[PDB]
């Protein structure tokens, strides 16, 4: 389906204009970046045996995904600010996020997200394990503090939520429990969540995990496999629009749902205030 749609989109500008015609209006963007140690080896097949966070003259998958998403959504972001957080490094493990800048100051445009990402990366100690509860909870706080303005949270990660050793017997890990609880609680706010998978994964159990999230007032969550889309045999500019559309085409209907449910522009009043850690850098 997304392939069939993207065949007719030759540029990200075309995608942006389509999002607008589909009803997307003022829209804010939050970015969360996975700094787990697994990034060192999840590029075995997908990134020529280099770390997914490897910095060079060519953009790694994080930089690629940020660029495509940022360029597609830039026109809708009236103040051009992008709250950006890391998680999964040694300073946060699966418990916290850190802000890209001290005092939680937001990036000014996706270009600054990219620049600051490159500044931060070599200074980090990569760790784990993997939970998306802290980053989703951070996004909830930002939405609440904005007085209910519509946000899209884009999480870019190289693995599924950490599973229980006893997953085969139907048991959930604390990471899974908290992450699912956060996705559900997030649906009480005007917030859309996009989990972008980069690297080798594996990702086969992710879309099953997504399918089994408890029923919510609106479908506020999607998984998109960047690796799989980019590994396809077609034009790069077409793979890029297919990724953009796969990630974002569901955003305008979700936005419309936040209006229908009257979530837009109001405070929920029951959102714990998560505090981001400072960036663990010089
Ligand atoms: Mg990982
Ligand atoms: Na904004």
UniProtKB/Swiss-Prot annotation:
Domain of life: Eukaryota
Bilayer-crossing regions: none
Keywords: Abscisic acid signaling pathway, Cell membrane, Lipoprotein, Membrane, Metal-binding, Myristate, Nucleus, Stress response, Transferase, Ubl conjugation pathway, Zinc, Zinc-finger
Nucleotidyltransferase listed as a keyword: no
Annotated EC: 2.3.2.27
Cellular component, GO, one term: nucleus
Tissue specificity comment: Ubiquitously expressed.
GO molecular function: ubiquitin protein ligase activity; ubiquitin-protein transferase activity; zinc ion binding
Residue ranges annotated for the VWFA domain, each copy included: 28-248
Changes after translation: N-myristoylated.
Location(s), subcellular: Cell membrane; Nucleus
Catalytic function, reaction form: S-ubiquitinyl-[E2 ubiquitin-conjugating enzyme]-L-cysteine + [acceptor protein]-L-lysine = [E2 ubiquitin-conjugating enzyme]-L-cysteine + N(6)-ubiquitinyl-[acceptor protein]-L-lysine
Membrane topology, from the record: Lipid-anchor
Any GO BP: positive regulation of abscisic acid-activated signaling pathway
Disruption outcome: No visible phenotype; due to the redundancy with RGLG2. Rglg1 and rglg2 double mutants show a complete loss of apical dominance. The double mutant seedlings rglg1 and rglg2 exhibit a dehydration-tolerant phenotype.
Chain's role: E3 ubiquitin-protein ligase that mediates the formation of 'Lys-63'-linked ubiquitin chains. Regulates apical dominance by acting on the auxin transport proteins abundance. Together with RGLG5, mediates the ubiquitination and subsequent proteasomal degradation of the target protein PP2CA. Functions as a positive regulator of abscisic acid (ABA) signaling through ABA-dependent degradation of PP2CA, a major inhibitor of ABA signaling. Acts as a negative regulator of drought stress response.
Complexes and interactors: Interacts with the heterodimer UBC35/UEV1B. Interacts with ERF053. Interacts with PP2CA.
Name assigned to this protein: E3 ubiquitin-protein ligase RGLG1
Species: Arabidopsis thaliana (Mouse-ear cress)
Gene: RGLG1
Residues included from the entire protein: 129 to 410 of 489
